Subunit: 216 residues, 2 copies
């Protein structure tokens, strides 16, 4: 029951370090990351999945200064996913996407492929040429992926917490992201909460629909 | 099985206009919209849910020019959700949120309420005062909501399609959004796909994880 899932999930504030994902769960979270939708199937993303103690420690380097209050979340979780966006949408990437759709059998003719390519380039060009906002456009797709992921892991029975409170300059440098054409946006530790997760026993709060919703 | 849901959902290209969701089903999609997470529980969003012939026709005015390929999706679907972001993060909104958390019983002391406000304002100020990107920051939270929503409605057994191919200036004007403090970002028609939805049976395509994913 997905409504139950959405109401019962919460942002975990403390993880049980003794509780790890099963091998199947580890495969399943990667599937969730991969199969998120995105505008034009542009998939303008990279994920770092940290499962080792060293890998997690490397990510937790970003929980520094004002962000130290998120360090233990990264360290004690089973798996920590860093969601990264491309910094620029280039034609090489657009070619990878369309070539992949072709390999998967989505095009009946070379002319269907070309038309799909031209449509995708229309949207990309709107951002990278007209509005000069392709960085933010791609970042939006990554945040969409994040929303999909949080509901997904909850439906798997897994605890998680989305994290914007991290130093992306430190995290980018740690994984050489800038040179590779990426930048880190959101860190999401995943696992099982401990008894120290104070947010497990607080009521969920949201603004009333009277404020956020209009019907016509 | 949420992985099955993830793999079997698709972007609907043709809706059965004879198949309306009940008011009770609409209640569930409104719950999904409301209960999405967001940075600091900022909830910097408004939703228009159009379900009448005239309501959807109003939204569909935005699918003009190069966007006519999306017009029929907005007209034929049962319930069409316009995701909107706030255009600026104001102090009044921040107070609304923390007061709601208080009303919902999340603070045992005044200092706990004050701490939550202070933390929230730290992030808000980072965006609106330092980076001058609060509009983009909030739009990112709205895209996260969209990701949650697309997986959610799929898990309810409902078809949908996310739409960026609309003229947001036209949609904003039609619903007077800008002077209200909002701007439209994504239109999501929801309903049941028709047998003429070619995309319901086309193979799904994603880049392999060997490109997009790094394990450490
Ligand atoms: C932000 C966003 C906007 C989208 N806009 C449109 C659109 O305007 N028209 C359309 O036919 N599909 C649209 N789609 C559907 C995508 O093309 C689709 O997600 C992608 O090809 C992956 O296939 P699945 O099926 O979703 C959009 C998807 C996203 C995530
Ligand atoms: C984009 C984003 C970033 C977040 N970052 C943090 C964070 O850095 N630290 C934290 O404790 N919680 C973080 N959260 C959790 C939010 O506070 C939480 O989603 C919100 O209060 C609603 O509660 P639920 O429980 O998720 C983040 C949530 C989102 C959506």
């Amino acid at each position: 029951d997905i409504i139950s899932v959405a109401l019962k999930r919460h942002s975990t504030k403390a993880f049980d370090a003794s509780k790890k994902l099963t091998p199947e769960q580890a495969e399943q979270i990667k599937t969730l990351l991969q199969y998120s939708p995105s505008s034009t199937n542009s998939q303008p993303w990279h994920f770092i999945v940290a499962s080792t103690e060293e890998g997690k420690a490397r990510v937790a380097k970003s929980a520094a200064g004002n962000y130290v209050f998120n360090e233990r979340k990264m360290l004690d979780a089973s798996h920590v996913v860093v969601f990264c966006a491309k910094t620029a949408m280039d034609d090489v990437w657009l070619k990878l996407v369309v070539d992949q759709e072709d390999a998967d059998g989505r095009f009946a003719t070379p002319e269907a492929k070309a038309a799909n390519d031209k449509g995708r380039k229309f949207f990309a060009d709107m951002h990278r040429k007209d509005l000069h906002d392709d960085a933010e456009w791609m970042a939006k797709q990554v945040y969409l992926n994040v929303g999909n992921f949080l509901l997904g892991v909850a439906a798997l029975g897994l605890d998680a917490v989305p994290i914007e409170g991290f130093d992306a300059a430190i995290l980018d440098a740690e994984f050489g992201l800038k040179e590779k054409g990426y930048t880190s946006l959101v860190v999401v530790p995943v696992g099982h909460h401990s008894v120290e997760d104070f947010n497990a026993t607080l009521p969920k709060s949201r603004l009333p629909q009277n404020i956020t919703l209009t019907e016509v």
